[PDB]
Every structure is written in structure tokens, then in C-alpha cells.
Design a binder for this molecule. Structure first.
Ligand SMILES: Cc1cc2nc3c(=O)[nH]c(=O)nc-3n(C[C@H](O)[C@H](O)[C@H](O)COP(=O)(O)O)c2cc1C
Ligand SMILES: Cc1cc2nc3c(=O)[nH]c(=O)nc-3n(C[C@H](O)[C@H](O)[C@H](O)COP(=O)(O)O)c2cc1C
Lengths: 162, 162
């Protein structure tokens, strides 16, 4: 079955999709109201100090706000939160109809997610068509069981079966 | 159920584990033979140019080799490759008993994985107890179906159910 190609586009996207991920929504306080963006390019980076990374696309209108933000929060979604995922993708409702709750640092959050990491901006680097934002975790919130993540793999949403 | 804590250690590790991932092995040619390391801190970063990242721990004896390498390859494991995962973790056999196959750039590879990204070193940044290595994808190999990844979530290995 095995095939080899040089990445210079459908085939590369399919290949990268072979790496399973959770699903997050990264939020921040924008110039004119709350902002969020569905992300799966998140990674845990460091335990001491507690650091995480994620990559906003430089082709998004929200890139500047996330890149200039001092604080942002990463919400890890449970398998029952597909609708929350879809609010913060391309066509999505964003925060329209959602209650305004804020962290002490003023970041808009989504209660009821599997995990929320509230982060202070720590470092940022350009990486092609995306940036890499590294944040220091100031606070952690967990809710519910840890073993029912929303999983995205091979372009499809699904569950983890242990 | 919802609880909030400040990350300054068991609780933080459990929280970060709530983010589901695939499982990779990153390989390179070491000073005295092939090297590999099981990694789940991998992310797709950029399509144009094709870029990926992953984070080696700075507490590993293999960190210097990966950090100084010009070339390294990321192997995305299928659900049937737990043994390959375990070869390249803490106590593992590494390449002992495995056939030596090399890329044109001299990187030792593991045929038969779901995806292999052969990368040239592109950038590197320190991030606490880990480094962040960004590589430019020079070649991609895929084998078999794309929708049976080995998944690691909530500290357990498992499968994706779409
Ligand atoms: C499962 C999933 C994961 C995503 N991950 C990322 C990401 O890591 N970074 C990013 O900038 N956009 C990501 N997106 C896209 C953003 O949510 C984006 O603003 C929009 O959904 C995609 O369309 P657009 O690129 O045309 O705006 C993801 C979307 C989905 C469905
Ligand atoms: C599922 C899984 C994912 C891992 N991800 C990473 C990683 O992203 N970076 C890293 O440096 N080590 C990672 N490790 C650990 C390395 O494989 C490491 O050299 C060793 O397994 C863990 O023990 P040690 O930290 O005491 O050496 C992971 C291990 C497992 C089981």
C-alpha cells in the first residue's frame, strides 16, 4: 500500500490528518468583544515552568488579536461538545447566544469543558503560514471525566475507545 | 465536578492528559548509531512551506543529538504498533533487533507506519523543560488506511471510533 510523495497538496493534508488530536477552542478578549478559534495544533510543552503551545493560522482575521494578546485560554473539549467546536470554526456563531463569563485576567471562557488552561503570553515565533504561540499556564480548570475527549482524526470527529 | 488549581504536579499532568493525541516515533542518526524517541508533543504547523513541530525533553540523554541533527523523521503509528511505541520509550529496546533501513539523507526509518514525515531542521527554540524543534518536510510516506491511529488519551492507549 505504501506510497511516497514530495509535499509541494491534497495528499499532504491527508497525511497530516493521520495524526489524531483532541479539539480545543482558544479564547481572548478582542478589540471589540470576545474572540475564539477552534484549534487542534495545541501541545503540552513544559511542566516546570508549565508551558503549552498552539498555532494560529496567519491567514485568519483573528491572528493579530491572538498574537497581540497578553492572555488567552485553551479549552479542551469533551466528546459531547461538537457544537462548541463548530461555533469557533470558519462559519461559526462564535460567542453569539453564549453567556459572558470572564477570568480574573479578563479572558472570556466557556464553562463545562474537559480542561481549561488560562495562559499568559510567554513567547511567539513565525512558522510559515502559521505562528507558534507559547503560553505559561497560570490556572487550570478540569470538569468531568478525563477520558471522553472529542477526537479529530483522518478528517472525522469521533471518540476514544481505550 | 469542576475544580480549579494553580499548576505549581500530579493534577497538572492529569489535566494535560485530557488532550488526546496520536503517537509518534522521531528518529535520527546519532553519533554512534540510530536513535529514536517516542513523542506525542508533535503538531502539524504549516502547509506552505510544509512545516511540523515536536518537543524533545531537555532531561533526556538524546536531546543533544536531536537538537544538533540536520535531519530527523516523524513516524505516526497505527493502532497495531504499540510494540514500536514501547521500543522508543524510557525502558525500551530502541533499534535492537529491528532492520536498518535509511532515507536518502541517512535517517533510520521504520517501514510500515501510518505516516512518515522526513524533515530537515528548520528552527529550534527553548521552552522550559523541553525544546521546540520545527522541521521542513522534505518527503512524505503513507501506508495503509489513515483512520486507525494509535491514540493516547487520559494516560491510556486506545483506538479512534469515528
Ligand atoms: C478540528 C479542527 C482543528 C483546527 N485547528 C486549527 C489550528 O490549529 N489553527 C488554526 O489557525 N485554525 C484551526 N482550525 C480552523 C479555525 O477554526 C479557522 O479559523 C476555520 O475553522 C477554518 O477555515 P478558514 O481557515 O478558511 O478560516 C481548525 C478547524 C477544525 C475543524
Ligand atoms: C505516549 C507517550 C508520548 C510521549 N511524548 C514525548 C514527547 O513529546 N517528548 C519527549 O521528550 N518525551 C516523550 N515521551 C517520553 C520519551 O519517549 C522518553 O524518552 C521516555 O519514554 C519517558 O521517560 P523518561 O522521561 O524518564 O526518559 C513520551 C512517552 C509516551 C509513552
Amino acid at each position: 500500500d505504501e506510497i511516497t510523495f514530495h509535499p509541494a497538496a491534497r495528499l499532504l493534508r491527508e497525511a497530516l490528518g493521520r495524526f489524531a488530536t483532541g479539539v480545543t477552542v482558544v479564547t481572548t478578549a478582542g478589540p471589540q468583544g470576545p474572540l475564539g478559534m477552534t484549534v487542534n495544533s495545541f501541545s503540552s510543552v513544559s511542566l516546570e515552568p508549565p508551558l503549552v503551545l498552539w498555532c494560529p493560522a496567519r491567514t485568519s482575521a483573528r491572528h493579530a488579536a491572538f498574537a497581540e494578546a497578553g492572555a488567552w485560554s485553551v479549552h479542551v473539549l469533551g466528546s459531547e461538545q461538537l457544537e462548541t467546536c463548530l461555533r469557533f470554526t470558519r462559519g461559526g456563531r462564535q460567542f453569539e447566544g453564549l453567556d459572558t463569563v470572564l477570568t480574573p485576567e479578563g479572558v472570556p471562557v466557556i464553562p463545562g469543558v474537559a480542561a481549561r488552561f488560562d495562559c499568559a503570553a510567554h513567547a511567539a515565533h513565525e512558522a510559515g503560514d502559521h505562528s507558534v504561540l507559547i503560553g505559561r499556564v497560570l490556572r487550570v480548570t478540569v470538569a468531568g471525566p478525563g477520558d471522553h475527549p472529542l477526537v479529530f482524526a483522518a478528517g472525522r470527529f469521533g471518540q476514544f475507545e481505550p
